Amino acid sequence: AVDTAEQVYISSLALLKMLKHGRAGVPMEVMGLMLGEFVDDYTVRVIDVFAMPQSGTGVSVEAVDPVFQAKMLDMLKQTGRPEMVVGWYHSHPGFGCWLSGVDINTQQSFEALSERAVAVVVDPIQSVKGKVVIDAFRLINANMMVLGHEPRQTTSNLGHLNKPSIQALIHGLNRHYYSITINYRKNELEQKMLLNLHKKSWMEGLTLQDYSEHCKHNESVVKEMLELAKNYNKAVEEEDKMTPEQLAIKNVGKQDPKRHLEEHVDVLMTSNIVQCLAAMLDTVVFK
Amino acid sequence: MIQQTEITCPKVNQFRQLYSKVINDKHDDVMAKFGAILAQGILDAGGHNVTISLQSRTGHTHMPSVVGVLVFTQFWFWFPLSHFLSLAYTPTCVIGLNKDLKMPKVQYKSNCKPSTFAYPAPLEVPPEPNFQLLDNPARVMPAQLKVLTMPETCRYQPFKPLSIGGIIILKDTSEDIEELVEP
Amino acid sequence: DLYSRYKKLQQELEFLEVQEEYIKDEQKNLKK
Amino acid sequence: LSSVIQNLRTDQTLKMIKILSGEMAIELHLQFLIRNNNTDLMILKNTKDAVRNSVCHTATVIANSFMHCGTTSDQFLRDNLEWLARATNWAKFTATASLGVIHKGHEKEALQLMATYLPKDTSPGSAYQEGGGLYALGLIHANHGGDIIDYLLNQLKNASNDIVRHGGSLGLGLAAMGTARQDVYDLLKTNLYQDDAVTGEAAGLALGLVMLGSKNAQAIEDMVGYAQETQHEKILRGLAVGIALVMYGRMEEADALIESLCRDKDPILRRSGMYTVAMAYCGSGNNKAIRRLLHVAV
Amino acid sequence: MQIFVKTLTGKTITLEVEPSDTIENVKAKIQDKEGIPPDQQRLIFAGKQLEDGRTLSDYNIQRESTLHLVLRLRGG
Ligand SMILES: [Zn+2]
């Protein structure tokens, strides 16, 4: 029955609803419903996600009147397209991703009312540098605890798509629920135009760096590599002429090799060879 | 390593205990031991009687042996695809059948510059000759196909020069042929 | 053995001109 | 061989037919494997007892089938049948698939042996038994036409479940591998246009099997014309191999097709173009191909 | 009478209740047929919240009426 080759197909505009609704209420645990489609037994997609209003605190979240949900889904039928729900989500800002006490109670309610109802956990205050810790989990029945739990190895791609860390396998993994794999449904006329509007330019190439601070910046770059050249003179030649060990403390905890002295030269070329050639075009182009 | 002995490379016994280490350990992965239990069946495939090769006898290449191995490379995506590796199993026989039923038991020998190898014995541990006579349905390593020698003391000499394992005929020049047996 | 060696020196030359190419190509993408 | 046996018939005549189709060449090969046998029982016992309640029964029934391929000896299906009936739902599929690998080549004997297990009388609620059963009959009768293609063709005309549509199709494409019969080509086209999201791996592999080294003008165009509008990924991986398996050693006659799949940005279809340039170039020292292969490798 | 409880999951549950019954009886029947406690069920009739302190005749619920089943939504 249950496979280990499921991949949820979230859309790009789904995940942008997830982080924006999660960053909106940070200290109060936002809470919404996830709308998608079951195309077959073990691939599920989710493209558009709406939200629900909440009244919860920073550790638990309640709900509102249920006359809002059925009136929402009725109005989404006539506009765009209709679907049936495939799960739900929340935000766990404090800790990582595991299913709490009432989180497993609402999971039992949805997998009995609906079919399978994958739940998704989002940490909004972790997705900071370049990476996100979004994950989706899924309850397993407690009766099949003498046989396999997510058994029946069909493929071998289920091992490198997820590696549960020590903070994950202590709460519910793997005796209560299990994790599921996430890929991103990327296509054309959505992804290319996503970068055709964000990291683009027209006049940025043919624009001067305004020499009031350009050559002023090069003063404080020449003087610091001047001091590194003061440091470089003694360092290598004293090390080689005293002991030829090619080793200790000048090997274990040092930082002044021939890696540090040319990267300041590397920055100083790219900042100036471009800046020299940028002032060459407009002499020809602009009369 | 297929149908190879200790004298071919000493790393065979280093790997068989490497297989037994990672399959009799408890603190490993299912994915790690899955490659080990698969390596048990490949190394002893067919009872040391078949071999895999993308190359035929006469410089040509096999179509099903390439098909059998490239679909086997797709074992990540579907585990019953690994049954298709059996299409690349090629025999290592030298059976000298001359008539459509005549299978005489010709005792041909070999000549090895080292001592004996080639079909080791199973282990259960819980003045040497070099002219070993073999019958016609007998295995032979593909690396010792040139060091065999037809029996010059017998009149029965084959038509094609037996220099590479495959199938040949026996040019019978005597009278009163015998020794037919079929299980 | 004066002609069989002569083609083998070409194939060792042609492989090596390929083997110098993509490693030189890989170093660009490995900087990325 | 099928052409030269057709141009031959355009006794010593009947003697030279049988050796050009191949009947005794299987028989002496079968006789060679039933005489000589060196399979150690103890190692397989030393691997069986070191298995916990995990998924490794499939790993063992694929292990013995490799080392008893053509041995035609059943002893693990005889000493612990209760151990074989432990795991389920594809282990029963793989085990009856493994029975055909052990009987690698009989052409009559394994048919009447597996004539005991009819595909309507073993179990009504176990399609994996007959699914791996018909998968095993294709493994045994490989590259030998006759009644057996037509006997399996009529079974796929009246298949019950889609699991049965797998092992029937992989057996039927393997039994007609390289024949390019139009009748099995029509059945596997309309199998692909069923819009089924589970037999797409089954139809994609076997269609390249029956069209192996054919270079059809329309099969490649229909399969890449099908694998653009679909919305599953097993349909894309089945057709990934099948558009590679249709061509085998053309050496300059796929260079438009190799470029057409690498220029596209579907990741499966870029991956499938790499298998096609592998299969079109066998044993060749094409410096331009290895130039192109390693540039897109990095 | 026969009612059509149109749930929000695309599944219509047919029940055999009486016009003189209440909401707790329907909740108990749903719990017996599936496994959802009564406190986690919110029956909605034409955008109106049904209360357990009234009967089916108070909300003009006749034979074959479209309902809406909403479960208790709460996370932590
Ligand atoms: Zn939660």
From Swiss-Prot, chain A:
Pfam families xref list: JAB (PF01398), RPN11_C (PF23594)
Binding residues annotated for Zn(2+), in chain numbering: H90, H92, D103
Domain MPN: 8-143
Chain location of the short sequence motif JAMM motif per the record: 90-103
Gene Ontology CC annotations of this record: cytosol; cytosolic proteasome complex; extracellular region; ficolin-1-rich granule lumen; nucleoplasm; nucleus; proteasome accessory complex; proteasome complex
Modified residues (Phosphothreonine): T243
Tissue spec: Widely expressed. Highest levels in heart and skeletal muscle.
Modified positions (Phosphoserine) in chain numbering: S127, S201
UniProt keyword terms in alphabetical order: DNA damage, DNA repair, Hydrolase, Metal-binding, Metalloprotease, Phosphoprotein, Protease, Proteasome, Ubl conjugation pathway, Zinc
BP GO annotations: double-strand break repair via homologous recombination; double-strand break repair via nonhomologous end joining; proteasome-mediated ubiquitin-dependent protein catabolic process; protein deubiquitination; protein K63-linked deubiquitination; regulation of proteasomal protein catabolic process; response to ethanol; ubiquitin-dependent protein catabolic process
Alphabetized GO MF terms: endopeptidase activator activity; K63-linked deubiquitinase activity; metal ion binding; metal-dependent deubiquitinase activity; metallopeptidase activity; proteasome binding
EC number: 3.4.19.-
Family: Belongs to the peptidase M67A family. PSMD14 subfamily.
Name by which UniProt lists this protein: 26S proteasome non-ATPase regulatory subunit 14
Organism taxonomic ancestry: Eukaryota, Metazoa, Chordata, Craniata, Vertebrata
UniProtKB/Swiss-Prot annotation, chain B:
Known function: Component of the 26S proteasome, a multiprotein complex involved in the ATP-dependent degradation of ubiquitinated proteins. This complex plays a key role in the maintenance of protein homeostasis by removing misfolded or damaged proteins, which could impair cellular functions, and by removing proteins whose functions are no longer required. Therefore, the proteasome participates in numerous cellular processes, including cell cycle progression, apoptosis, or DNA damage repair.
Source species: Homo sapiens
Similarity field: Belongs to the proteasome subunit S1 family.
Shown segment, full-protein numbering: 695 to 927 of 953
Annotated protein name in UniProt: 26S proteasome non-ATPase regulatory subunit 1
PC repeat residue intervals: 1-32, 35-67
Quaternary structure and partners: Component of the 19S proteasome regulatory particle complex. The 26S proteasome consists of a 20S core particle (CP) and two 19S regulatory subunits (RP). The regulatory particle is made of a lid composed of 9 subunits, a base containing 6 ATPases and few additional components including PSMD1. Interacts with ADRM1. Interacts with ZFAND1.
Phylogenetic lineage: Eukaryota, Metazoa, Chordata, Craniata, Vertebrata
Superkingdom per UniProt: Eukaryota
Modified residues (N6-acetyllysine): K26
From Swiss-Prot, chain C:
Function, as annotated: Component of the 26S proteasome, a multiprotein complex involved in the ATP-dependent degradation of ubiquitinated proteins. This complex plays a key role in the maintenance of protein homeostasis by removing misfolded or damaged proteins, which could impair cellular functions, and by removing proteins whose functions are no longer required. Therefore, the proteasome participates in numerous cellular processes, including cell cycle progression, apoptosis, or DNA damage repair.
Protein's cellular compartments: Cytoplasm; Nucleus
Protein name (database record): 26S proteasome regulatory subunit 6B
Family membership noted in the UniProt record: Belongs to the AAA ATPase family.
Highest taxon listed in the record's lineage: Eukaryota
Subunit annotation: Component of the 19S proteasome regulatory particle complex. The 26S proteasome consists of a 20S core particle (CP) and two 19S regulatory subunits (RP). The regulatory particle is made of a lid composed of 9 subunits, a base containing 6 ATPases including PSMC4 and few additional components. Interacts with NR1I3. Interacts with PAAF1. Interacts with TRIM5. Interacts with ZFAND1.
From Swiss-Prot, chain E:
Consequence of substituting H68G: Loss of DTX3L-mediated polyubiquitination of histone H3 and H4
Glycyl lysine isopeptide (Gly-Lys) (interchain with K-? in acceptor proteins) crosslink location in chain: G76
Recorded consequence of changing K48R: No effect on HLTF-mediated polyubiquitination of PCNA
UniProt-annotated site: Essential for function, residues: H68
Residues with (Microbial infection) ADP-ribosylthreonine modification: T66
Residues with PTM ADP-ribosylglycine: G76
Site (Interacts with activating enzyme): R54, R72
Cellular localization per UniProt: Cytoplasm; Nucleus; Mitochondrion outer membrane
Residues in coiled coil: none
Effect of R74G: No effect on ADP-ribosylation
Topology class, membrane: Peripheral membrane protein
Ubiquitin-like domain sequence ranges: 1-76
Outcome, altering R72G: No effect on ADP-ribosylation
Effect of S65A: Prevents phosphorylation in case of mitophagy. Decreased localization of PRKN to mitochondria
Residues annotated with Phosphoserine modification: S65
Post-translational modification: Phosphorylated at Ser-65 by PINK1 during mitophagy. Phosphorylated ubiquitin specifically binds and activates parkin (PRKN), triggering mitophagy. Phosphorylation does not affect E1-mediated E2 charging of ubiquitin but affects discharging of E2 enzymes to form polyubiquitin chains. It also affects deubiquitination by deubiquitinase enzymes such as USP30.
Superkingdom to which the source organism belongs: Eukaryota
Crosslinked residue numbers (Glycyl lysine isopeptide (Lys-Gly) (interchain with G-Cter in ubiquitin)): K6, K11, K27, K29, K33, K48, R63
Function of the molecule: Exists either covalently attached to another protein, or free (unanchored). When covalently bound, it is conjugated to target proteins via an isopeptide bond either as a monomer (monoubiquitin), a polymer linked via different Lys residues of the ubiquitin (polyubiquitin chains) or a linear polymer linked via the initiator Met of the ubiquitin (linear polyubiquitin chains).
Protein name in the entry: Ubiquitin
Source species of the chain: Homo sapiens
Whole-protein coverage range: 1 to 76 of 229
